[PDB]
Structures are given as structure tokens and as C-alpha cells.
């Protein structure tokens, strides 16, 4: 029943902007702690942004502070990651997950060309 469907990735020029979306079903995004992490091939996952359940307190990794914003639309049951000032080091597959739950979607590829 639970689905986490990321989209919005693509190839972007360094310095550009992109907005990722995760369309969720089977649970309400405003009742879970939703987080974005990214994974480059052969590397460990890097958690980059999260938004708490009920309230909207946010958390950001130091590597994306000042450049990324996480948000959600409760009515659309969707979580977003607004990215600005993208860098080659941001190239990765991006995943949107529930903290404390096992299941993960397929992610969306972001590629930033120098």
C-alpha cells in the first residue's frame, strides 16, 4: 500500500535550480517525519533535509544549508526539495523516506554538469 514516488530530477547546469517532488500514498505525509537523502554510486547515503511530523520544524545537513528547502503540501500528500545553486557534488539519486520506516522508493536522478 505504501508508495513513495520521487520525480523532478534531471540534468542541470552548475548554479541552476531544481525542485524535486515525492508523491506519497498509503499514509499522510504530515503524520511522518519525511527526509531526503541522496546516494552516489559506491558511496554512503548522505541525509540532506528533513521535516518533522505535525509541526513543520526542519533540519538540513551542513552540505546543503543555505541552498535547499524542504516543504510539504498536506492536501496533495507530497513532499518537495527546492534546490538552488547546484554544484557537481550534488549529483546523486535522491530519495524521500519516512524516518523510522524501512520502505524506500526508486528515487530520482539529479546530475549537475560543471
Amino acid at each position: 500500500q505504501v508508495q513513495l514516488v520521487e520525480s523532478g530530477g534531471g540534468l542541470v547546469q552548475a548554479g541552476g535550480s531544481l525542485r524535486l517532488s515525492c508523491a506519497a500514498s498509503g499514509f499522510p505525509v504530515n503524520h511522518r517525519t519525511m527526509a531526503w537523502y541522496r546516494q552516489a554510486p559506491g558511496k554512503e547515503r548522505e541525509w540532506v533535509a528533513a521535516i518533522e511530523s505535525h509541526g513543520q520544524e526542519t533540519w538540513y545537513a551542513d552540505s546543503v544549508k543555505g541552498r535547499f528547502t524542504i516543504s510539504r503540501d498536506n492536501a496533495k500528500n507530497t513532499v518537495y526539495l527546492q534546490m538552488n545553486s547546484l554544484k557537481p557534488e550534488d549529483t546523486a539519486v535522491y530519495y524521500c523516506v519516512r524516518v523510522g520506516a524501512e520502505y524506500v522508493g526508486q528515487g530520482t536522478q539529479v546530475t549537475v554538469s560543471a
Binding site: 511522518r32 517525519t33 527526509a35 554512503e44 541525509w47 533540519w59 519516512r98 524516518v99 523510522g100 524501512e102
Partner: protein, 157 residues
Amino acid sequence: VAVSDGVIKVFNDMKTPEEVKKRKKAVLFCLSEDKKNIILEEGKEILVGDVGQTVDDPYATFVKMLPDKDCRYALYDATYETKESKKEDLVFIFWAPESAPLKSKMIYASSKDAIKKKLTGIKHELQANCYEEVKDRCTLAEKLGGSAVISLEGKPL
């Protein structure tokens, strides 16, 4: 976040009658004060020798030790049965309740991969974000051996 020696030792121990009574049945791990290390949480364990003496239902006692508003890791040594076999396996548990503060919760969430890599040979993981999930014996049973598991921790499912 570093993993303390103690966590490394306890895992390897869990992988004479008096010595057997000192083996861990369950153990909780938490962040150190400076949030730079994952350490044993003092006193938050069940020993094999506790069971039948001060502990009657170790899984229920384990759940009672989970904090309402903070995250934890844990190892639980679970016994379970299918129709044809009786098995015992370690389960790595990540406890992340919704009302835990986001800042340290994200440290726990982002550090889970690093601690699990220290627990070489760990075969099963249960993540939970509320008590209804962590108390779901059917869910633990399914994380352990799927739909073939019919009893768990000495009780029928």
C-alpha cells in the same frame, strides 16, 4: 558519529551456567552527551539470568525501556518458530518515535548505517516510529522469518 568500544564488545558477545546468565537478551544504545558517539545506555538491558527471576516477558520489558520522546538503537536476541524449526536470531532495532526532537533524530537516522556496518553479520532489522509498531509481534515475527513464523518469544502468534 563514532561507535564506542562497548557497543562493539556487546554485539560480538551477542553474536558455565553463571557466565550464561550474564549474556545479554536485549540492550539499548544511545548518543553520548556530546552527540559524537554511540554508547551503551547504562542499565537499559535485560540479561539472560534476569528472565524467570525479575523479568517474565522480556520483549514487553524491552518495550517499556524505550523512551517516549527520544530515539534509540537496540539489539534484541529473539527466539521464534516455524512449523518445522526453532530459531534464534539477533534483531537490530531503530526506535524513532514521532515526538522525538528532530535534530537528534536526524543524527540517529543518518548514523544508523554506520553502526549497522559494525554489527557485521546482522541479518534482521526492525524500524518503528510508534509503540503500536514496536509491539506488533506479527511484524517482528515477519522481520525474523516472514509468514512462516507461527510463534515468537515462547508464545503462539
